[PDB]
Every structure is written in C-alpha cells, then in structure tokens.
Amino acid sequence: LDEHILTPASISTLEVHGATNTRRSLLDQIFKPVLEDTAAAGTTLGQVLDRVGAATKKLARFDIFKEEGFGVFLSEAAPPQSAPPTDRTDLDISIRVKEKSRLVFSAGTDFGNAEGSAYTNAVVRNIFGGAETLTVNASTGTRTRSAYNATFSTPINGNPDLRLSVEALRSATQKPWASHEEHLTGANLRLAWLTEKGDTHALAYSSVWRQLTGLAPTASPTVRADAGDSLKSSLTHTFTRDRRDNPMLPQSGYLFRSVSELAGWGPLNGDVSFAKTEVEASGALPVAIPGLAGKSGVSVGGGLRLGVLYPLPLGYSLTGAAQPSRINDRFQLGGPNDVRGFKIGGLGPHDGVDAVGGDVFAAGSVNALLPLPRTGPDSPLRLQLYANAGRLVALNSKGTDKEGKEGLAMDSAAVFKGVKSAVGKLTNGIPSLAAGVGLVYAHPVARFELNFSLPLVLRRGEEGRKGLQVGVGISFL
Amino acid sequence: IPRPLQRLFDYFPLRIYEPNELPERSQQLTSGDLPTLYVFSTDSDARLGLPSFNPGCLKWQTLLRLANLDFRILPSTNHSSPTGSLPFLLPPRTSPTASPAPIPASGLLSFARKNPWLDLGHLDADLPPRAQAYLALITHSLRNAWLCALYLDPTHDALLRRLYVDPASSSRAVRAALLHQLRRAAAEQVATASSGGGKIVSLAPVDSADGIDEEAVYRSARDALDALASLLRESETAWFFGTERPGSFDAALFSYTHLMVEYMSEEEDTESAKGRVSLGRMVKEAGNGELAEHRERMLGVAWPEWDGYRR
Amino acid sequence: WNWSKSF
Amino acid sequence: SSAWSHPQFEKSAWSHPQFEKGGAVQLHVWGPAFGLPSIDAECLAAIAYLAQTLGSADYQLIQSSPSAVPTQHLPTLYDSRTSTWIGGFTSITAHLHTTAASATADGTAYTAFLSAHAAPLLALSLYVSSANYGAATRPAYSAVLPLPLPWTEPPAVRAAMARRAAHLGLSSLDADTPEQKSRIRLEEAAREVLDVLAEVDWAAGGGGRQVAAEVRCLAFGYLALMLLPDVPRPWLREIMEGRYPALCTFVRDFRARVFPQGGKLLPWADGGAQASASASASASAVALRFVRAVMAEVPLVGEWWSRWWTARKKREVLASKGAKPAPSNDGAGVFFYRGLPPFGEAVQVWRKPV
Ligand SMILES: CC(C)[C@@H](C)/C=C/[C@@H](C)[C@H]1CC[C@H]2C3=CC=C4C[C@@H](O)CC[C@]4(C)[C@H]3CC[C@]12C
Ligand SMILES: CC(C)[C@@H](C)/C=C/[C@@H](C)[C@H]1CC[C@H]2C3=CC=C4C[C@@H](O)CC[C@]4(C)[C@H]3CC[C@]12C
Ligand SMILES: CC(C)[C@@H](C)/C=C/[C@@H](C)[C@H]1CC[C@H]2C3=CC=C4C[C@@H](O)CC[C@]4(C)[C@H]3CC[C@]12C
Ligand SMILES: CC(C)[C@@H](C)/C=C/[C@@H](C)[C@H]1CC[C@H]2C3=CC=C4C[C@@H](O)CC[C@]4(C)[C@H]3CC[C@]12C
Ligand SMILES: CC(C)[C@@H](C)/C=C/[C@@H](C)[C@H]1CC[C@H]2C3=CC=C4C[C@@H](O)CC[C@]4(C)[C@H]3CC[C@]12C
Ligand SMILES: CC(C)[C@@H](C)/C=C/[C@@H](C)[C@H]1CC[C@H]2C3=CC=C4C[C@@H](O)CC[C@]4(C)[C@H]3CC[C@]12C
Ligand SMILES: CC(C)[C@@H](C)/C=C/[C@@H](C)[C@H]1CC[C@H]2C3=CC=C4C[C@@H](O)CC[C@]4(C)[C@H]3CC[C@]12C
Ligand SMILES: CC(C)[C@@H](C)/C=C/[C@@H](C)[C@H]1CC[C@H]2C3=CC=C4C[C@@H](O)CC[C@]4(C)[C@H]3CC[C@]12C
Ligand SMILES: CC(C)[C@@H](C)/C=C/[C@@H](C)[C@H]1CC[C@H]2C3=CC=C4C[C@@H](O)CC[C@]4(C)[C@H]3CC[C@]12C
Ligand SMILES: CC(C)[C@@H](C)/C=C/[C@@H](C)[C@H]1CC[C@H]2C3=CC=C4C[C@@H](O)CC[C@]4(C)[C@H]3CC[C@]12C
Ligand SMILES: CC(C)[C@@H](C)/C=C\[C@@H](C)[C@H]1CC[C@H]2C3=CC=C4C[C@@H](O)CC[C@]4(C)[C@H]3CC[C@]12C
Ligand SMILES: CC(C)[C@@H](C)/C=C\[C@@H](C)[C@H]1CC[C@H]2C3=CC=C4C[C@@H](O)CC[C@]4(C)[C@H]3CC[C@]12C
C-alpha cells in the first residue's frame, strides 16, 4: 500500500458533506491552504495525507462536529487525464462530517452533597454559523448562595486557533486553610491564541468584586483585618510551552509556563495594585538500562516554580506610596499539588492556624518514575520517588527607617528594600523539605497519586502530613 | 501497625526553624499592646478614640470607657466580626504569631472586669421592671427613627455614602451595589416595627421604603424622646433612676442622642421645604432640654478631653 | 435525578 | 432606585388631619376568632378603643384582609369625612385623639414595650408552634376569608410572625432532657415579658401604675390572644393563669365588660361579621386579590412586582392624606433558530482553479 504514496499525484477536487449550519467561508480557511498546495511535485501523497491530516484535528478544534464523523473516502479519480504521470495521479476525496447538537440543556439535583443541591446547564453552539458558543451555568443548594456563569466564546476572523471569550461570573469559594470564604462577582475578557509551534498565549482582562465573608470562629486577626470588599481590575498574560510526551504523566520533554499579572496600575482602577508573576519550568528525562533495550520505563524528572508579588502605587507613576498586599492576592504554597507532603496551604506564614499567604515563593521538585515488576512499561500506573522543597516569605517594612504610623502605604524605596530582603530570605536556611514514595496513575482524565510522605525540614507553624496522602489533579510539581 | 512505627514518625521533622514573619499588612494592623475594639469609625476618628458613628458600636464603646478599660479603637466592618456584627474586641497578641480568641459584643463587660487599669455591676445591673419598658423606647422607637432618617432619607444620602460605603471601596459599581444592600437591610428592620411597618405583601419580608410609614416612625420617635425626658426629670441626680454614675441605660440612650445631634442637627430638614423637625432638633427640644444636657454630661464623663462635639 | 434534553 | 427613599412631593413627616367627632368612620379588621371580635392583637385593641370612645352608631367594623385595603396593613381606619386611610393601631389612636406627665410617659413606654416584646411572645404561641397553628389558628384564619385566599394570606401572616418572634431564638420543637430545656425556655421567655406587664394596674382600680385608656385597650389586645385561645399547647395560658392571677382577672373582666356575648353586639357592617366582607367579596375583587398574591412568588419577577405594587399603594394612601405625591416612572426572537435558512448547504465542494 505504501507504493501508492510514492507515486506522483495531483488532487483535483475535494468535497465536504453535512456542514449545513457552518458557513462555507469559515470552511474555506482550512481548505484553501490545502487547495493552494496541489500538484506541487511527485510523491505528494506523502505531503497531501499529512496536510489533510493536519486538517482533521484543525476542524476538531472548532468543536462543532462530532469526533466520530470523519469518514474518509479518498480514491483514484474516475475521469481520465491526458497523459497523466501515473494512473493514480488524480484522486477524488470526499469527507463526511456530522455536526454536534446545536443546543444542549442539562439540569439535575444531588441530595448526597446538600439537601437542596441543584444545578442547571445550557449550551448553545455554532450560533450564526461561525462556531460561536454560549454556555450558561446556574447552581443552588443549602448553606450556600446561588452561583451563576455565562461564557460566550468565538473564533476571531475564522481562525480556530485565535479564540476570544467573554465571561460573566458570580461564585463563592471556600478557603478552609484561612478560615474564610471568598465571594466573586465580575467579568473576564480573554483572547486565547495558539501559536503555530504549539505554544499557547492568553491575554485576559479581569474585573472581579472580591468579598471575604463567613469567617470561621478560628479566624486569625490577620484574616479578620483583611475581610471586606475589594475590586481587582487586572490584565494578565499566560504563556505555555508544553513539549512533554505525555502531559498527564511526563516521561520526556519539558514544560514552561509564565503567568504575569498587572493589577490596578495606570489605566486599570481598583482597590488593589500590584505586579504578580509566576514561572513554572518542568522536565523529564528517560534513562535506559542494559538489561532491556527500547523503552525502559524509568525516568528522572524535575521542577522549579518561582513567584514574586510586587506592590505598586495607583495612578501612572512608578514612584509613589504602595499599599501592602492583601490575603486575596498573596501566594499560597503546600499541598498534594504545590509542595507534596504538606497540608493544603501548609507552607509559609501562619497566624495561629490560618495559612496567610506570602509575597515571594520558590518551590522545586525532584522525582523518578519506575514501573512495577511483571508489568509492562506501557502501563499507565507507575511507582514514584520524590523529594520536594519550598519556601514562602512575606514582605516586611522592617528595613525602613521611619514612616507615618497613620499611613499603611510604603514608599517606593521601602518596597524595593522589602522585596530585596524577602528574596534574600529564600537563599538562607534549608527550605521546607519533604520526601516520600508513592504510586501514580495516569488515567487521562486526572492523575491519581497515593503518596507516603515524611516531612524533613519545617518552619514552626507549618503543617506537615506524615501519613498517606492522596492528590488528584492535572497540575503537579 | 501505627504503634511500632511511632518510634519513626516522632523523629521527623529533623530540623525545625523559627516561624515565618507575618505579612506587612498583618504586622501594622494586628500588632498592639492594648486591646483593640473594632467599630464603625474613620481613621481620623480612631486616632483620637472619638465616638463611632454607629449607635450599636457607640453603645459598647461608651460602656468600656465608663468601665475604665484602657483600649484603642479601629475601623472595621461586620464581615470580620465573630458574631457577624460589630463591635468586638481582640486582646493583644501574646506572641507574634498567636492571639487569644476575640471577645464578642455580649462578653465585653466581662472582659473589662478582668482587666482593671473593681465593681462594674452598675454597667450591667438588671433593670427594674419599669425600666424595661422605657428601654424599649431606645431599642425600638429611637432605633427605627435612626434607620429611617439615615438610610431612607435622600437628604442624608451624602452622609450615608461618606460614612459607610465610600471607605469600603473606590469602585463606583461596587459602591452602588453596597449602597443598595445597606438600604435593603435597613428598610427590612424598620418594616418589622409595629408603628411604621407591619405591612405584609408576600412570604418575603418587606424590604423597601414603600412599605415604611415615615410619619409613624417619626411620630413614635418624637413621643419617645418626650417620654425619656420625663423619666430623666424624675431622678434627683443627673442620671436615670437616681444613680450616682452612668449605667447601661444611660449609655444606651447616649448612643442615639449623641449621633442625632452630631449628624442630624442641620437646618435643612427643619426648613419649611421638609416641614418636619430634624432628629437632632427634637433631642435638644425634648422636654425642657434634659436630653441635651444629659448628652453633654455623658461626654464630660466618658470623653473629658474632647471638645467641638456640637455638630 | 439528572435530566438531559439534548436537541 | 427611588424604591428605597422617602417619596418625593410635588412643589416628609406630613401630619394627618385632625379628627372631629361626628363623622362616620370604618375600621377594617380581621374576622372574629376564639370568641373574640378579632384574631389579630392590634385589630382587637383597635376594636376595643372604638367601642369605648365612639358611639355605637358613629363607626362600622368591616371584616377584611390586608389585600383589601390600600395600606396593606390591619387594622386600618377609613375616615370617610376626608377619605383618608390610616394604618396601624397607634396611628388610628393618634388620628382619633382629641402626675399627668409621668402617666403620659408610662403610656408611651408600655405601648412600645407591648409592640416590641409582647408581640413576639404572642406569635410564638400561635404561629411559630406548628401544633397550635395546624389545629387552632389556621382554621380560624380560613374561616374569615373568601375561598381562594386561605392559601395565600395565612401563609404570609405566619412568615411575618415567625420573623417577629425570630429574635427570641426559639423555634417550633420548643412547643413540646431536651424537652425540659425547651419547656424552661418557654417559661423563661414568657416571664421576661409578663413581669414587666404585671407592674401596671391594668384594671385601673387604684394603686400600681396608672396609664391612659389608649394603652389599656392595647394591653387587652395582646393579653386576650394569649389567654383565651384554646390551643393544643396551652403552656402560655398555663403560665398566665397560675403565676399572674392579676393579668388573668384583668382580661376576664375587660372581656365581660367591653365584649359581652361574644362581641356580636358591635356594629359590624351589613349587620354581621361575614356580611361586612361582602362589599369586597365580589368575584372580580377576590380574583384580583388572589392573582396579585400569586404573582409575588415568581423567583425573579415576583420580587420586583411587589416592590412596584407597594409603591403604587403607598402613593394612593398619601394622596388621600392630602399630600401631593410626585409621579413615578413605570421579531428578532423568531429570526434566529427559526425562519432564516441554514447558513450553508449539506454539500460544499472546491476544485483546483484553472
Ligand atoms: C504582562 C501583561 C500585563 C501585558 C502588559 C504584557 C503583554 C506582552 C508581554 C504580550 C502581549 C502580546 C504578546 C505577543 C504578541 C505576539 C507575538 C508574536 C509571536 O510570534 C512572538 C511573541 C509575541 C511578540 C508575543 C509576546 C508577548 C506579548 C508582547
Ligand atoms: C528543568 C527545567 C528548567 C527545564 C524547563 C529546562 C529547560 C532548559 C534546560 C532547556 C529549555 C529550552 C532548551 C534549549 C532551547 C534551544 C536551544 C538552541 C540549541 O541550538 C542549543 C540548545 C538550546 C539552548 C536548548 C538548551 C536547553 C534548554 C534551555
Ligand atoms: C548541547 C546541545 C546542542 C545538545 C547536544 C544537548 C543539550 C542538552 C542535553 C543540555 C543543554 C543545556 C543543558 C542544561 C542546562 C542547565 C541545567 C540546569 C541544572 O540545574 C540541571 C541540568 C541542566 C538542565 C542542563 C541539562 C542538559 C542540557 C539541557
Ligand atoms: C526535547 C529534546 C530535543 C531536548 C531539547 C530537551 C531537553 C530537556 C527537556 C532535558 C534535557 C536534559 C534534562 C535534564 C537533565 C538533568 C536533570 C537533573 C534532575 O535532577 C532534574 C531533571 C533535569 C533538570 C532534566 C530535565 C529535562 C532536561 C533539561
Ligand atoms: C558555611 C557556609 C559556606 C554554608 C552555611 C553555606 C552554604 C550555602 C552554599 C547553602 C546553604 C543554604 C543553601 C540554600 C538554601 C535554599 C535554597 C533554595 C532552593 O530552592 C535553591 C537552592 C538554595 C538557594 C540553597 C543553595 C545553597 C545554600 C545557599
Ligand atoms: C538525591 C539528591 C539529588 C537530593 C534531591 C536529595 C536530597 C535528600 C534525599 C537528602 C540529601 C541530603 C539530606 C540532608 C542533609 C543534611 C541535613 C541536616 C540535618 O540536620 C537535617 C536533615 C538534612 C537537611 C538532610 C535532609 C535530607 C537530604 C536533603
Ligand atoms: C396558580 C394556580 C394556583 C392557578 C392557575 C389555579 C387556580 C385554580 C386551580 C383555582 C383558583 C380559584 C379556585 C376556585 C375558586 C372558587 C371556587 C368556588 C367553590 O364553590 C368551588 C371551587 C372553586 C371553583 C375553586 C376551584 C379551584 C380554583 C379555580
Ligand atoms: C375541589 C374544590 C371543590 C375545592 C374544595 C378545592 C380547592 C383546591 C383544590 C384549590 C383551591 C385553591 C387552590 C390553590 C390556591 C393557591 C395556591 C398557591 C400556589 O403557589 C400553589 C397552588 C395553590 C396551593 C392552589 C392549589 C389548589 C387549591 C388548593
Ligand atoms: C363559572 C364560575 C363558577 C367560575 C368562573 C368561577 C369564578 C370565580 C369563583 C373566580 C374566583 C377566583 C377566580 C380565579 C382565581 C385564579 C385564577 C388563576 C388565573 O391564572 C386564571 C383564572 C383563575 C382560575 C380565576 C378564575 C375565576 C375564579 C375561579
Ligand atoms: C395558568 C398557569 C399554568 C400559568 C399562569 C403559570 C404560572 C406560573 C409562572 C406560576 C403558577 C404557580 C406558581 C408557583 C407555585 C408555587 C411555588 C412554590 C414556591 O415555594 C416557589 C414558587 C412557586 C414554584 C410558584 C412559581 C410560579 C408559578 C409556577
Ligand atoms: C554538604 C552540606 C553543606 C549540605 C548537606 C547542607 C546544606 C545545603 C547546602 C543542602 C541541604 C539540603 C539540600 C537540598 C535539598 C533539596 C533540594 C531540592 C532540589 O530540587 C534542588 C536542590 C536542593 C535545594 C538541595 C540543595 C542543597 C541543600 C540545600
Ligand atoms: C527610588 C528608586 C530608584 C528605587 C525604589 C528603585 C526602583 C523603582 C524605580 C521601582 C519603580 C517600579 C519598580 C518595578 C516595577 C515592576 C517590576 C516588575 C516585577 O516583576 C519585578 C520588579 C519590577 C521591575 C520593579 C522594580 C523596582 C522599580 C523599577
């Protein structure tokens, strides 16, 4: 069959079947580059099948059509050609696709979680024929307030890789590690973009009304002092270069993420003003052994996560009085995802029992994946040996000479001196360190870990977990 | 299985360091050598310890000053209160990362008895049965007048905005949302009153100024002040029921008479354009003026250093 | 229960 | 939003016109229950006040419900001499009004106390306790309303009374060791109120504390609904009969003097308690009252309906009172997913250009 791809070829026409709702103009953007690159040279099926092979998940990224409807009926063209280079130079191709349901409505209740827990979901897709979507979620229950959501998403100028999203949000988030809950209400504007190299860009504008209510009776004075309302209008950029072979259980390749957020400064307005950035670099490296050629299954990985939260003045001046950060914005570290072997939010400053955040943090990981004996390396479940370190510090004005005690704000030189001292604190003393052994499951909806952790170095007030610990999620250190 | 391995778990952590320092905001606000009472006030008011603008918070702030407790006040909000409502007192930190449990409003007087700086029975003495009837005037007749005149009067919109919602956030959209919730909650409480309320539209409570009768609330307050002035005139001393020192009853009344004179003694409501006497004017005109000088005397006892309190 | 009326 | 502010007036505490004796007035109250002229405490007090200060032919009693009056509140007085609507007991007495200073202050003090604290105690006995509601008072409420209403008004009344007694901290199971602590809290809460009321000489026979007849009528209204009503949980009746014989004697003597023979001698409109409601029991009127009551329960629209409706009724009462209230402010859905053709055909094809 491979000899059919080595022959010269020249495609004549292509047809798409079943795309009644989607406008043909949107369909053009994927097929014109296919249409332009035609009859370029011999052995073009080596080029042709891959370029249409690009198209199939190109249309799948539109999410309009069902994943099963991709019946390919490529064959030799019936009409003859005048002195063709090869009997199968001319081909006829027709593609069969079935669009997904235009409207999806869902609702239900679940008495197992709450006495009156009920949810309502509605999805409208491919409105106006151009892959615009609209999802509305509503949730109620008992001992809780109503939660709404309404996201409108659309590709820009017919490009499936450039997607603009508008979201209206109202939700309440429980934060047991700080003995309070946060009520969110606002709107987000996102412009997600996928580069040709696979890198993902995302520029989002957010304007959310945060409100700290429902303090537990054990709430610390720090949590009480930060309770109340706060409006954060921020502009955030998210970058992601993921080259991991299996992103859900990495055996090779590397991941790089950057999340830079600017709030309140300049044209943005609100009750907070800072510049927050995070960098997350990860990687893995397979290792082979003489006892078995090919894929051995053992690999050594790593990780490194950094973050700095810099207070900024309001207005358009870089030099000016800056308010100290609030518990809403400060970083949180520790837990089965961030730093394995500790309580959720178990690192950093603690006021009594509440885990108050920090402004500068740095976490790292070293782990090795191994397969169990009498089980092939292709199995999605493996043994893991890991060692995690982390530091979370808070900005202080101890280095300042004098400031008006009425004012809470810090001058520009004071903040810079405070950040320099905070970063210096990371590099002294052994970081809060934990190690353990566990089993990892790579079932592609979520990673499951069964870890036996054992804290080694710890700051007083931090909470380690010496027993078995289970962590489920898509992000791990 | 846990028992044999307990000899291994007790070994870890191998190194324990000193605790991480608290954030800058926590260090500035929550660090103090004196117990702090969290009330509705401004940053300039809190510096000198001047009376709060919330009658519920001013009642307890007055008693603690009569209890001779040394304390400082700080502006706050109901969200931080252990009971969901101000005021409350946080004793000073014993260690930089630990603090004793907050004292709710009901337990403030017990706290003051443990920290003399002495018999404080007069501040929480059980009122005589007749005194219970008059206390209903302060808690219901005067409270409803305060709520209607402050939250539901467009004349005091600038004052209400400045006091309660402006310090909450700088966002106009958030300010408008907070202002609506304040007026909804205030109108709900007045609607429960017998005189200015009692109307029922559906299962949900009445939560608008349309269900409130302004005259019934206003007339009840005017009748209440005349009654309270008559009760005060009965005592041979300067305080209610002839006591030689101000008590819980005096502090309860002062929390309303002071604020009515402070914030609603203007001559705009008393103008013919409104046709009604302002709350601060009725306080000074009640009886022969007993409630006016009682407010002056109460300030001279709890705030002897203060001046310029007329308006 | 959890209803689903997709069309 | 103008729904949370004092109403504007065309160019706030506008006093009501002074009443003069002689004009016929109509008092809209609940129907009789428990052998009393009315079932609501304030309505019963208002009936007693009229029966003592006005002649038998100078006023009329009309059995009604809150939906049938523009004030949305009972009792309400319609002073036909100027067509003004006055709602609430205190407002009616003030409207009809023509060591005295110590006596005047005492009357004001207990008037506020009875409304503030005696009312939640009464609500707890008759409304919060589900045993007494389902057997003693809900039948009484339904017996005085036209047919479709007992499914809308009495449920609304209970919600108000439950909110009224909410500050006591007790709930339905306390109407019944967990039983012992519930019982002692019942006796504690009642004693906290009845101790204050026992200070006054309600019978006005001499001694004690003397108060104006306006508040003695109000005292009977709250006390009568606490003693006489025979309920499956007579705990509140038991406390008053045993611990406070003076209050029991005052109620019995007052009822026998002011309401002899079930109180049927009162000048009810159209010669009877039920015949009085016939003026507003017409099919069209009752249907509108029921429909407006239903609309308020819509989860989103209903809340704004009642706020708009209440404002409309508020203007009507104020306009009658001589004031001048300011006036208040009041396809494409088929073209999408229908009508317009699908944006493309099922077949699209392209070929290599020439
Ligand atoms: C940090 C936030 C708050 C905001 C201000 C920052 C935005 C910058 C950093 C973002 C916005 C648009 C981004 C951007 C747009 C387009 C491209 C073309 C691509 O081929 C290389 C990267 C490049 C050049 C990226 C780089 C990062 C940019 C310039
Ligand atoms: C463990 C973490 C830090 C992971 C993300 C490691 C990343 C580093 C080591 C990787 C990421 C990108 C890599 C990288 C990108 C591009 C080139 C250009 C090539 O001509 C020389 C190697 C060089 C320069 C390599 C070197 C190794 C780099 C810099
Ligand atoms: C030299 C290039 C052209 C080709 C042969 C290979 C490059 C890889 C193998 C090299 C290039 C840069 C190297 C590299 C850069 C920096 C570090 C950080 C250190 O903490 C761990 C090792 C690590 C991550 C090493 C690992 C090996 C890398 C990634
Ligand atoms: C994908 C190929 C072509 C090349 C460019 C990629 C190389 C990266 C991803 C590999 C090469 C060397 C690897 C590497 C070397 C050594 C270590 C030390 C170990 O303790 C942590 C992991 C770490 C840091 C890993 C991470 C992943 C690296 C950096
Ligand atoms: C006598 C002197 C020479 C001894 C005490 C000093 C040793 C240095 C080299 C050690 C002590 C603490 C160590 C240290 C502490 C914490 C961290 C954070 C971690 O994420 C990166 C490495 C880093 C930054 C390491 C680097 C090496 C340090 C700085
Ligand atoms: C395998 C290497 C690459 C790295 C990742 C592993 C480190 C772990 C397993 C080991 C190596 C050295 C150990 C180490 C060195 C010295 C001390 C000082 C002692 O008073 C407390 C324990 C402590 C702090 C331990 C903790 C555990 C460490 C940090
Ligand atoms: C929202 C729901 C509750 C609405 C639409 C339903 C209304 C119906 C079921 C109710 C409303 C009024 C009711 C009604 C009114 C009066 C009478 C007269 C009586 O002698 C027989 C029953 C009868 C005829 C009932 C029957 C049921 C009716 C018609
Ligand atoms: C069968 C006839 C003769 C008569 C007796 C029957 C009347 C019943 C069935 C009718 C009369 C009034 C009706 C009624 C009144 C009001 C409401 C409130 C609404 O939110 C739910 C329905 C509900 C509760 C309905 C249900 C059906 C009722 C109760
Ligand atoms: C032929 C006669 C006996 C019929 C019409 C009776 C009418 C009277 C009893 C009135 C009284 C209450 C009225 C009533 C109540 C509530 C509603 C709900 C509304 O959404 C439809 C009309 C409906 C159902 C009406 C219909 C007419 C009723 C039932
Ligand atoms: C002719 C009828 C069928 C037309 C007018 C329908 C009206 C709807 C909008 C009305 C009729 C009965 C109403 C109804 C009955 C009972 C309740 C229970 C209450 O706890 C929540 C509201 C709820 C659920 C309301 C909502 C609005 C309903 C469902
Ligand atoms: C030989 C002496 C000087 C050693 C053991 C004492 C102290 C320092 C230098 C040791 C103790 C624990 C070590 C340590 C623990 C764990 C990790 C996490 C890994 O991702 C990066 C290296 C790092 C951060 C190393 C660096 C070197 C450290 C910090
Ligand atoms: C008196 C001056 C000279 C002192 C305070 C020094 C610096 C001043 C100018 C301040 C003003 C704005 C600050 C500034 C803005 C934003 C960021 C992004 C953040 O991710 C790293 C720090 C950084 C880059 C800081 C560094 C310090 C700066 C540049």
Residue numbers in the entry:
A (entry chain B): 36 to 512
B (entry chain A): 16 to 132, 140 to 333
C (entry chain D): 1 to 7
D (entry chain C): -33 to -23, -10 to 76, 104 to 181, 233 to 386, 401 to 424
Quote the study on this structure.
The folding and insertion of β-barrel proteins into the mitochondrial outer membrane is facilitated by the sorting and assembly machinery (SAM) complex. The SAM complex is composed of three subunits: β-barrel Sam50 embedded in the OMM, and two cytosolically associated subunits Sam35 and Sam37. The seam where the first and last β-strands of the Sam50 or BamA β-barrel meet is called the lateral gate. Unlike other β-barrel proteins in which the seam stays statically closed, the lateral gate of Sam50 and BamA is flexible and required to open for function.
To better understand how darobactin A binds and inhibits SAM complex function in vitro from a structural standpoint, we used single particle cryo-EM to solve the structure of the T. thermophilus SAM complex bound to darobactin A. The SAM complex was purified as a monomer in LMNG/GDN, mixed with darobactin A in a 1:2 SAM:darobactin A molar ratio and incubated at 4 °C for approximately 41 hours before freezing cryo-EM grids. One major population of the Sam50 lateral gate bound to darobactin A was separated using 3D classification. This final SAMdaro cryo-EM map was reconstructed from 163,391 particles to a resolution of 3.00 Å. In our initial cryo-EM map, Sam50 β1-4 are rotated outward by approximately 45° to form an open lateral gate. PyMOL analysis identified six hydrogen bonds stabilizing the interaction between darobactin A and Sam50 β1. All six hydrogen bonds are between backbone residues on both molecules, which suggests that the exact amino acid sequence is not as critical as the overall secondary structure. Therefore, it is likely that the backbone cyclizations of darobactin A are restricting the secondary structure into a conformation that is favorable for stably interacting with the SAM complex. In contrast, the Sam50 β-barrel is most similar between the SAMdaro and SAMop structures, superimposing with C-alpha RMSD of 1.54 Å, while the C-alpha RMSD of the SAMdaro and SAMcl structures is 2.79 Å. On the scale of fully open SAMstall and fully closed SAMcl, SAMdaro lateral gate opening is most similar to SAMop. In contrast, in our structure of the SAM complex bound to darobactin A, the Sam50 lateral gate is wide open with no interactions with β16 whatsoever. Our cryo-EM structure of the SAM complex bound to darobactin A suggests that this inhibition of SAM complex function is due to darobactin A stably associating with Sam50 β1 in the open conformation.
